[PDB]
Symmetry: C2
Subunit: 665 residues, 2 copies
């Protein structure tokens, strides 16, 4: 039976579900308030064809499909966006070069073009046949043909269902109503708690430095950023901050970091936060080793113990060490590495954990656990965090982490960014190295139109200016990222409050689009790749305007575009609005007013909801935030006319002078 | 507890095993007689380290490894021979281009270089970590190192066990003693019933013809073989013999085969047997469709019903039709196609079968079932068969079928032939098409040193002579195949009686050898590949002689060989013997005496056991067979001296005049 638990959200419990699952692993709390405000809509499967069965130790699910229905999701795929006709086993792993279901966030959630979604709340590995099976008792069984004589004989005849096998005696399933595909995604995300509300400093630029950097090396890099006029909010430290790595001590190396408290404070006094690399695997020389040992798995990763983070006895020593030795010195956050795979690095499924949780369910949720309990340390102190994680899953929407990996195909990086929007996670196509200045700038351009603007120089030692043929353009895109901070922050506020993914695929207001994405509500981004002079851009219905010049670009048509090296193709919807702050080098503080230039595109009257609060604490949870409504139009003479709603009494107000600019002459 | 059930064979039952498994699926009967004659040997795991555990619904197995122990097996792999350090999920499938465990015969049997083997008797998909897991409580846990400072830090530290996960509440495990790796393989094979004893006609040449051939077309091809002087024993008919294919009617097409009884008889009267392509998927127009329908799975393959061959009610209509419409007309055997995969063609694991058998266990054993019940039809009539099958598994050693596939990488074809010897199945690297005459001859050369000498022209329409630059050499290798018939037949007799795989890897009397194999007891085959002028050949200790000239080649060393296009590198052990019959075009009948030239290589006194019987019935089961012992030496003057043991009273005797030839001048 399907219990309508929120508007457009239904829940069925099939058989006897396991006591551990994805939502429970994450400790994911629904945002009831936001959910209650969504439209009531009808059950998406109104005409039967749904079958939920327990048998032979497993749970068999079947959901119907109509002809010309297309599917999206099944997690963080890198080479496919359309999922109908695919066969997958959803299984946490480092991405392996093919979309098989093995990936960093193999979210068991899919979305239909008909405007609904389905989430399977199991922490097991899950098999999916997304319209490949052909059933003899199907209402749509194609007529059998003779391959010997009939030219129309087809190797892939019509399949009318999504079939899913969960290896357990039952499962919780959730179905999400529409009417549009994005509505289903938003409800799914809100069931997960909505997206995290990042700190403003998390949307600034981050530089990760080489593994071997000393505190002195870091101080110098910071000084070079300032001297050269490049923005920077947080520096990423790689494994050499620890006295041992692989496996880890979780303590500052005495030689590379003699005085941690002093170093963390100096960087902070200069506006620079720190984010620390960890993997969660415990060295014998870690100060809590003996205490944690009984609460660790049978198998090690890089010879380090694997904590069973489902046990308080493992959590307390691990997270206490992070709290006391780093967070309390001022460390802003973490990069939770290598909680994904490969199978030959992580523990095998044959491993045993002291809680009794299967190693399979541990593999599926390890990332979720480390995100969960690390984030909680920051929430307890009324401070936001923002960091990186190499694995996540269903249940992880609300965590303050962005996914990254060691793969590097640029096209595929963009495709993953698209799919991140169907998967309830954030993904950054990071910049590390490049053969050429061209590739370096192309990668930097797409990166600044993503959740996290980052160069990860852990091995490369690169900086934004390392490629001199393109350094001036790289600088421009770095400063653009800062200038766009109010646009991104408002987008992330929609992620938190309404569950709206800030980066997502097209047609989420015919053929597969793998290389364009929406970035916030107003911008269509169409990246260039190295070696290309031009590309096609498919524009949805409605008028679009050039992001740079403001000129009319097109409407419901395909463009051939030759942008030059200095531009990433970006197009703004009619009436679209991008609030721009000044090109600050550091994110603004909560007590700081910032002027805004409201760049308004096209001729349709536009409306933007600018989010404002202190940008660093959880005070917004008590209602200390505002949405400032901005409206812009051209008057009868063609001159820009704009308004902003008034600041609200008693609320934080960081909006300075506001000027309006009609970008379309 | 380990019950020693035969000499060098032990059985443990862990937990509660499933009532269906591989041995039961195959109906595999042990050859007690042959097994009782093997040496008693000690239990291979004498020092502990074995763990058999049931937990969380699954069976966890761990077997210890010593340092420098190497592993072989885990089924029919195409790119790897050494299996230590590999991670696999054993899963029946068409080979996918990588050794992941997905393959045609994913036999859950492995062999150690220390001289033992292990077989996991489950029809589930099975996970294997062959010395990749590193356990914290291991006796051999490497010392944790610091990757920040230590150059010796290793990403793959020492693992001391094979770990296997079976998804069931228990399992039967079998362990096989040594002392040598081949001894373990032989016992495994004998537990399965030994290899099938093929008919002599099955070791002749087979031509499969284009799908669209009519009976007239086949008659003509047969006449061309005879006219051109090429050998032929059986012709393969492809899907057009059926009135419908994909899915199938299992009845002769009225238009292409008007008079089946007459056609089958004409071909037979000319010495030519027929082997018929089937897949087991049922057309609505098949004459037994209505009867079988309730005993078929929920899902179809190419819109054909999938019989549950575990039910007598499915077996009877299916196999009765084959019996009455084909076997009783004289059809010699079948090619059981497309019982492997891919996942998007075969039924999904979510399918349901009317017997209640999981679709997983069905996938794992479907090939075994169709081999089993088809072979039985022939045994009931006291006639041997020999054919082809695209899937098999543990339990399938005794079946009269050779595996083939639609992959075509030549190197990998040879590697699969090597691995076939560790996997309890036969594999043929078939010939279909080639870009060049060179490739065509190279492929033909390796093929005639394999279980089945075959061109499969189902799509290509090729014949042995299709490439005129190499046609004379192709002919020579075809006639060689016939001349070598007594050598091959004796090798296959060892397969049946002693479990000795007729094709196998090296070191089965340091580094991985993927491109050489032993063919019978005496011949080391080292194939050339197209584009190569020369290759290395690693010779084991002991003297070796050139197969063609008889000259000394080497001893415990590596050769660089430039054979020419007209030769496949083959080397004969010291004292090795190849009995040669004449270059007949058709296999000899049971009532026929055949002269033999005994080609003796080197100088060590040699001994060969020539197997002899009627070559077509199961009378050998009643004791109507003989082993004729042949001994050859050079006398003090350097002249060949040979003997053959006397024919046995009352037994079939096909040996004619016997002459001896010392190949090494
Ligand atoms: O060794 C440090 C590196 O470790 C990798 O696992 C990670 O993906 C890299 O981004 C970097 O952190
Ligand atoms: O359609 C006929 C063909 O079918 C394939 O599945 C098979 O591998 C080929 O060898 C040939 O039999």
């Amino acid at each position: 039976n399907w219990t309508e638990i929120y508007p457009g959200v239904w829940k069925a419990t099939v058989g006897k579900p396991e006591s551990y699952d994805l939502l429970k692993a994450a400790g994911a709390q629904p945002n009831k308030d936001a959910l209650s405000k969504t439209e009531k809509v009808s059950f998406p499967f109104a005409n039967g064809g749904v079958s939920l069965e327990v048998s032979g130790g497993k749970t068999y699910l079947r959901f119907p499909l109509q002809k010309e229905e297309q599917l999206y999701g099944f997690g963080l795929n890198f080479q496919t966006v359309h999922q109908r006709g695919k066969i997958l086993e959803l299984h946490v792993d480092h991405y392996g070069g093919k979309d098989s279901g093995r990936t960093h966030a193999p979210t068991p959630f899919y979305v239909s073009s008909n405007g609904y979604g389905v989430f399977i709340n199991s922490a097991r590995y899950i098999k999916v046949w997304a319209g490949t099976g052909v059933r003899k008792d199907s209402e749509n069984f194609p007529t059998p043909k003779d391959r010997n004589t009939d030219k129309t004989w087809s190797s892939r005849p019509y399949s009318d269902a999504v079939e899913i096998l969960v290896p357990a005696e039952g499962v919780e399933v959730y179905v999400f109503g529409g009417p549009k595909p994005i509505d289903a995604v938003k409800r799914y995300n809100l069931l997960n708690g909505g997206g995290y509300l990042p700190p403003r400093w998390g949307l600034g630029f981050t530089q990760r430095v080489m593994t071997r950097y000393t505190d002195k090396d870091v101080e110098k890099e910071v000084n070079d950023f300032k001297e050269k006029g490049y923005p920077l909010d947080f520096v990423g430290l790689e494994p050499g901050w620890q006295s041992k790595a692989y496996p880890g001590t979780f303590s500052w190396d005495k030689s590379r970091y003699p005085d941690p408290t002093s170093f963390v404070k100096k960087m902070k006094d200069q506006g620079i936060r720190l984010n620390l690399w960890i993997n969660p695997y415990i060295s014998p020389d870690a100060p809590f080793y003996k205490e944690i040992k009984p609460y660790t798995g049978s198998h090690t990763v890089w010879l380090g113990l694997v904590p069973d983070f489902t046990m308080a006895e493992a959590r307390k020593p691990f997270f206490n060490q992070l709290l006391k030795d780093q967070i309390e010195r001022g460390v802003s956050g973490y990069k939770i590495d290598e909680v994904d795979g490969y199978d030959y690095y992580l523990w095998p499924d044959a491993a045993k954990f002291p809680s009794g949780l299967s190693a399979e369910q541990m593999r599926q949720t390890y990332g979720l656990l480390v995100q969960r309990y690390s984030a909680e340390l920051y929430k307890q102190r009324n401070e936001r965090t923002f960091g990186l994680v190499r694995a996540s899953n269903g249940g992880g929407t609300s965590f303050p982490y962005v996914i990254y990996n060691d793969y590097y195909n640029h096209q595929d990086f963009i495709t993953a960014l698209i799919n991140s929007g169907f998967a309830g996670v954030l993904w950054t196509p990071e910049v590390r190295a490049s053969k050429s200045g061209e590739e370096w700038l192309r990668r930097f351009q797409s990166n600044v139109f993503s959740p996290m603007a980052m160069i990860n120089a852990w091995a490369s030692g690169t900086k934004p200016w390392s490629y001199p043929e393109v350094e001036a353009d790289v600088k421009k895109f770095a400063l653009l990222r800062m200038q766009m901070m109010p646009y991104w922050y408002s987008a992330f506020a929609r992620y938190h409050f309404e569950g709206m993914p800030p980066f997502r695929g097209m047609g989420l207001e015919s053929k597969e689009i793998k290389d364009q994405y929406m970035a916030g509500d107003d911008l269509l981004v169409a990246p260039m790749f190295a070696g290309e002079k031009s590309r096609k851009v498919v524009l949805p219905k409605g008028k679009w305007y050039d992001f740079y010049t403001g000129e009319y670009a097109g409407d419901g048509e395909v463009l051939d575009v030759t942008p030059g090296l200095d531009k990433i193709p970006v197009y703004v919807r009619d009436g679209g609005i991008v609030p721009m702050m000044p090109a600050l080098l550091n994110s603004p503080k909560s007590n700081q007013k910032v002027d805004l230039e409201i760049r308004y595109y096209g001729n349709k009257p536009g409306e933007f909801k600018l989010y404002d609060d202190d940008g660093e604490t959880f005070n917004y949870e008590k209602g200390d935030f505002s949405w400032r409504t901005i409206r812009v139009e051209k008057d009868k003479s063609g001159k820009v006319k704009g308004s902003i709603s008034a600041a609200v009494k008693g609320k934080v107000n960081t909006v300075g002078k506001v000027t309006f600019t009609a970008m379309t002459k």
